[PDB]
Write a protein that binds this ligand. Structure first.
Ligand SMILES: Cc1cc2nc3c(=O)[nH]c(=O)nc-3n(C[C@H](O)[C@H](O)[C@H](O)COP(=O)(O)OP(=O)(O)OC[C@H]3O[C@@H](n4cnc5c(N)ncnc54)[C@H](O)[C@@H]3O)c2cc1C
Ligand SMILES: Cc1cc2nc3c(=O)[nH]c(=O)nc-3n(C[C@H](O)[C@H](O)[C@H](O)COP(=O)(O)OP(=O)(O)OC[C@H]3O[C@@H](n4cnc5c(N)ncnc54)[C@H](O)[C@@H]3O)c2cc1C
Lengths: 482, 479, 482, 482
């Protein structure tokens, strides 16, 4: 069997499917997944082609973070030809994948100085270091925005050639391009990967059928590790992936207008953020919340909807207040337990993984697809992706001290982003009383592993049973790798 | 008989006709989509005493409307029994709560909330209704923000709620069981000649003949009848009272045993939670009178509804899952009172303009119109709400101008805003002039109620001018 | 002539001075203290004749609290004849001591339900138990008030015969009555009490002079214990008194109007509260903040002034916003470390103490004065003031558990009273993270003594050196008494 | 009589007194005014030597505004030698007049974009046009400040050589320098200026005395025009001066620290502003509110104190919250009805006026003093000050349209500066409903004169009788000059 099965119909599954089908016209490539795309991240995405917009001081302070950033900058160079190659299989009436060429990053005071001020400085530095075209511009020169004056930006950064795509039109163009290249869509879900004598045999589907294959590529988003972890030994050799549950919305604007550019803040408390992505036809996309959940969730909370709407109406455009809500969207960012993606080969011959991309899998998709296809054809793919091999000991990209500083800063940032109004002694009081319980949790979980802040807050407020299960997991991983 | 409309009023009258006249063919029009439908967006509360305001009970027309709501409450137990009788256990229960708790908090204007709470208490005592002012600590389930918490609570016995979705299903089933036929199309035009109804042209191009046409098309009811000769200025206009509500799956699957509500608030919105089966709660409900229909919630409406419920009722709703944002059009009559009964056109009847409490009044209104169709006199106090009439003037222009400014200020206090203390008095004084000027400009005789006056104040000049023309044409017709 | 020296020129010193001079024509009575009245509580007081208004659920849950309450109810009965006897020594132009006969207690939502709702219920219960004349009234029937609707009361309680005095006119009338009865005012401060062979010899003054006496009555407010603690053994036998620093203000109202009654809330976080006391001549008194300080402070903080003004303008009358500020007043409530007053005799012959009355020494003054004068004349004074003898082991009126529940409730109440606006998950988060540090502090301070909540918060946020000094103090007290 | 009487003991009276006494050792110069300095602006001032810091877009849009700005830049050059000459008459223990050399202007979002953003741009432009030393600096590089993150600055401007003086030390140094130069201080107030045959005879004082003089210089702050208006015809020939009532405070900082520079915002709603001026000895000055009052007021309102304290603690330093309030200061900025100063000679021989300097008389004092002394000695003084001659038709520096735009913008700015939290439709609603009543008022007051925004808001909210009296005044001025 030289047959290829791609498990997953998100941006990563379809992107790798398209690259395999185009590159190996000799082989049969079958892509699994249903049109409902349950918990799907890609359909809930705007989406921003975020390289520089995703820069944080905390990310760029670690070697693993600087490597992830380098890959995002590399991926940006592939997008123009990738889009051309996908629109080539379609006509004008299919709609345009690209919705904006440029991004404006806004700095307002509706957040923590320790995140927003540091992150704005880090973005400016990363742009200069990469020789990317950009300009700090007068806020008065930013098109379209009409913020509440008390929520308004005082600094603005124009990033040239950092744009957005319509995630729905991208998925349609990938499916069309996949079929054009001879790929076959089988609208069922994989239940189980079959392997024996350290080699893949194929996939059992949820209609009871068995599909044989020499290659299985797992791109099932937040379900990817749970699917592979069933194979012998792999439960403690493939890092867990959780659901980074994200809420976004489509709004029909009061006057049918929209901005010419992406409008965004830097990443904010626990990897949420505020952005507006232009859409065709009098629609705008607003996003996006983030909460790491130990179990999947397919519905927005009241809190998430209110926070998203309140931020957009005050910080971007008060006209959105009177605008019509068309759709609340919910998707699961694949959130890796060690904070880095799972991309490449396994100890099982013919078994590949493309997952754990959290906030920027869609942006990195053309690079990640080409990397995995290179590896499948006996190549070395892309240089900096080696460290993010899916079969690995949990990465420790930061000291426990750095993470404990970060988790307290991010907790305080949930206050400043609201924005709260409190007596002035309360924030210092909460800072001092948060340090102890988070230090105690970190020490209790493991002697070697520390979860990143986004996951640590989820664990802090989870049931005792869920905490104990994670202590067991971390201990089993240490046993396996040490 | 053709019933035009598949809301609570159309189906309720359809069921009563089909059961009462087994000799006649009754056909009910309307689509399963129920576009702009009020009934599916309703909780719904069987609100009689809960709907009492000081402003309503200060007018004779308001006191008449209240009397009818108290009468309607007595019909509900046997009405529900008669609708559930046509179904089985698996169809679910129409009744979702027996009792209501009215909460008084300070997240609103004293001039509405304090006056309205006193008016509810008075109306209960006057009607000898079973009720008790209770300790807030004794209210089950609620977990408000302390700064948004109630300091007074009122338990109303036998004032409850129904599942509006299960009610609609039970009405459709009961209608079919009684020999009614559902034709899922919309009426485009009522046909009449020699002052008598001939039937209805439908939107699939067909013509259905009838000796009787009952218009219960919610907010579309007057626009449908106004096409017939003279009736444009003889049937009071009905606008869309666009309302937003939501279904929430609670964090722990719990819900309150009773309806939880405030009194009616700025421009006939209000905060309430209606129990549902299966770990769901209904939260409602916004209200904005729109001169044109709107089928989607605004961001502002969604945020206001969620913010009020999480702070004033239960902070646990914050972490609860949003299942559905619902939008419907309360039929908002331009003179503030319903359109119920016969026309100058033989066989033409209207059941509409019920705004906030058509669903509660439905069994009474259905029986009234069926009595009239059988040559009876129906219910005594419904005469004044005959659909073919001069616009009612239930309040002085002065009362309405006081009310519209109070309600405008109440939008601030309900937010709740935080302002420099001189700003509210400054806004009160600068609001009075423009609203007095608008009222004087619109007509020398008619004043729109506050809910509609705010919509007109912030409408286009062309829409204002069209209303000046309408009011002038009505005065010409009746004076 | 067998000389008596009263050390202190507040309400308690002058009240006891007047009672001695009137009752004992045989004794020469000299009263020390300067007209500046440094750190003086009495001049900063409104003052309310608070018996029922001062009731809290927490106070009435302890035996010591119920005893203190009984004495406040007894003191109320003495005020009419006491005022008559003080005004008798003056003329019309001296002004009236009594400023109001009745009090209205208001319940609004600008505070914690766990204090304000419980305390309102406790006031209502105490009134019914005492058969005191009172009526729950419609808020619309409360005269004069014009609150912000979002800060308005929804319940109101009229207390008949619970009134107020002008503290300044009371002090003037006491000084005049003291002179009329043959008392002498010596405007210097005591530096040292002289004692040998377990008997008082007299007082060294701060002008270097020595005044001989057979009797010394210490009524020096918050300085009372520090003055007596210099005598042998008494450092660990007289409970420490700290400064309950309070800020109040005199305001000339926009229209010269004022309310006919006292307007107040129940006691709020850390024994502060909101009240308005009527004054003559188009003036109103607004009060009053409270912060226990381990060292004296004679100036208002910005925070205290803003909190007091914000509460009064929103919760009582918006007209106060445009009213003229005449005076910011600061005084030290004598705050006893064990939460109960220091009234009566010492192990030193002729040495008496009248202090540690915290919030209601002025109200209790005629009763306390008569008690101590009775004791000095060989009488038994008033029943049930025995328990508040100044030379004692620290009282433990509450379990450590009760105090730890109270300190967390009061801490949260500082938020609700502001009032803050926070994300809805934050208060529960702060409640859970406050419990641990306060339990840890309580355990560290002593194995037997627990400071009441008002003092525990001050110790929690004091320097490590001040905490260690208090650990030493508590240990030295245990050694002395066990 | 060659005797000179200076009426007023503020910065302008004493500055002109010193210059006359030093320049004319042959003449007797007597300076009137009491040490209480009732309604005195100078003692309530920080004070900033504000030239560029005082720049607004609205001021620099008028020719009269640009002229006033040029004079402020000229005045700055005189300060170093002026201070040297005043300190020369004293000793080390008298303390230093200068308290800072530099100013940092901060831009935060606690205000209207239409004032704060425009004014920050106008300051930057005025600095570049004048070639003045300045630098836009990183906010993180601003020393000492510790703002609430939600109230923090995002832009900062360092202005070199724009500093501050201690107003109290300046007044002491001026009085001492006046005596050293042979001036005599007579601590009484002028009641009446005596003139006949178009020449000054002298001054009747409030102790009933008459002082003869050939020269009377009126520098009585906000009382200056009311004093001269009693002389024949001058009621409608000298523009009215009102009280710009200002509230400031002296604070002892928590740790005795203070900033090395002035910290300020640009001028805000109705010519108030937020600033901190360094002082010696662990004190800081915070200011300053402004409200034009048609009658004098000597006491702060609650509202003014709360606004000043809230702005300083949130926007400058949260440490000020726990800092001790030493003094609330109130003074009357002389607010000319036509918005420009009254400097120079009259139609009455020997009668001079130095007044109506509003926010920057103290800064301009050395220039203004030298101008008037030059004129008295038959010189032409300083070129651009001719236009601000005290005997004039009311200046119309702006169109009625410009003022109506300004008054509505400033009214809305009172909301954004609070800062308020409102439903997003409310500000647009208030903007539209404010325009009509202010247009109606402006049209009713006069067909030719429009009061500037600061005065127009005061007139809008004054009694009908006060409005009618102003209609009469404006009509009488038109009659006199047309
Ligand atoms: C948010 C919200 C909350 C509410 N809460 C309550 C509550 O608590 N208690 C209460 O008593 N009531 C409540 N109501 C509803 C209120 O009682 C209304 O007055 C009542 O539902 C109106 O019923 P109706 O049948 O007249 O109109 P609808 O329910 O609107 O029904 C009219 C129907 O006619 C159809 N139609 C329109 N045009 C045509 C045509 N040409 N031909 C055929 N069909 C047509 C529409 O699609 C619709 O389905 C609420 C309403 C809303 C929107
Ligand atoms: C803001 C505020 C509000 C209050 N409101 C009320 C109220 O509503 N009702 C009420 O009943 N009470 C009220 N009180 C007061 C409370 O009852 C006090 O407990 C009471 O005033 C204590 O009186 P005192 O005479 O013991 O102390 P103080 O009034 O402090 O008098 C002590 C005096 O002794 C002087 N002194 C200090 N050291 C020496 C020395 N060595 N030699 C000589 N003299 C010395 C001090 O300068 C001072 O003048 C309030 C107090 C404050 C601060």
């Amino acid at each position: 069997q030289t047959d290829v099965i791609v498990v997953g119909n998100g941006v990563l599954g379809l992107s790798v499917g398209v690259e395999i089908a185009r590159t190996r016209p000799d082989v049969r490539v079958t892509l699994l997944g249903k049109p409902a795309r349950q918990y799907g991240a890609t359909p809930a995405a705007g989406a921003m082609l975020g390289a520089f917009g995703e820069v944080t001081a905390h990310a760029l302070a670690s070697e693993h973070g600087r490597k992830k950033h380098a890959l995002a900058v590399q991926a940006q160079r592939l997008w123009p030809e990738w889009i051309e190659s996908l629109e080539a299989t379609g006509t004008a009436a299919d709609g345009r994948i690209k919705t904006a060429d440029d991004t404006v990053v806004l700095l307002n005071t509706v957040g923590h100085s320790a995140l927003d001020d540091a992150n704005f400085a880090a973005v400016l530095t990363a742009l200069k270091e990469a020789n990317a075209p950009h300009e700090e511009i007068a806020v008065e020169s930013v098109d379209w925005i009409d913020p509440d004056p008390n929520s308004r930006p005082l600094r603005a950064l124009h990033i040239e050639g950092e744009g957005s795509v319509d995630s729905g039109i991208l998925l349609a163009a990938l499916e069309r391009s996949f079929l054009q290249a001879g790929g076959r869509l089988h609208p069922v879900d994989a239940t189980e990967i079959r392997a024996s004598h350290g080699r893949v045999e194929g996939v059992v589907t949820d209609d009871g059928d068995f599909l044989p294959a020499g290659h299985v590529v797992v791109a099932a988003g937040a379900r990817s590790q749970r699917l592979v972890a069933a194979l012998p030994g792999l439960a403690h050799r493939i890092p867990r992936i959780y659901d980074g549950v994200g809420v976004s919305a489509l709004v029909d604007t009061w006057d049918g207008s929209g901005p010419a550019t992406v409008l965004r803040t830097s990443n904010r408390a626990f990897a949420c953020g505020l952005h507006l992505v232009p859409r065709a036809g009098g629609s705008v996309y607003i996003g996006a919340t983030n909460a790491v959940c130990l179990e999947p969730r397919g519905a927005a909370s009241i809190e998430e909807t209110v926070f998203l709407f309140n931020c957009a109406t005050h910080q971007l455009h008060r006209g959105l207040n009177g605008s019509e809500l068309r759709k609340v969207q919910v998707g699961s960012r694949p959130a890796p337990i060690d904070g880095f993606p799972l991309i490449g080969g396994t100890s099982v011959e013919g078994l590949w993984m493309l997952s754990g991309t959290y906030r920027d899998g869609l942006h990195m998709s053309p690079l990640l697809a080409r990397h995995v296809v290179s590896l499948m054809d006996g190549g070395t793919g892309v240089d900096g992706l080696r460290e993010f091999r899916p079969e690995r000991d949990l990465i420790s990209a930061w000291s426990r001290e750095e993470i404990l500083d970060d988790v307290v800063r991010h907790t305080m940032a949930t206050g400043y982003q609201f924005p709260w109004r409190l007596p002035l002694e309360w924030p210092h009081m909460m800072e001092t009383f948060l340090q102890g319980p988070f230090a105690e949790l970190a020490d209790r979980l493991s002697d070697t592993y520390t979860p990143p802040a986004d996951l640590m807050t989820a664990i802090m407020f989870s049931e005792r049973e869920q905490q104990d299960e994670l202590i067991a997991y971390y201990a089993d991983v240490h046993r396996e790798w040490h």
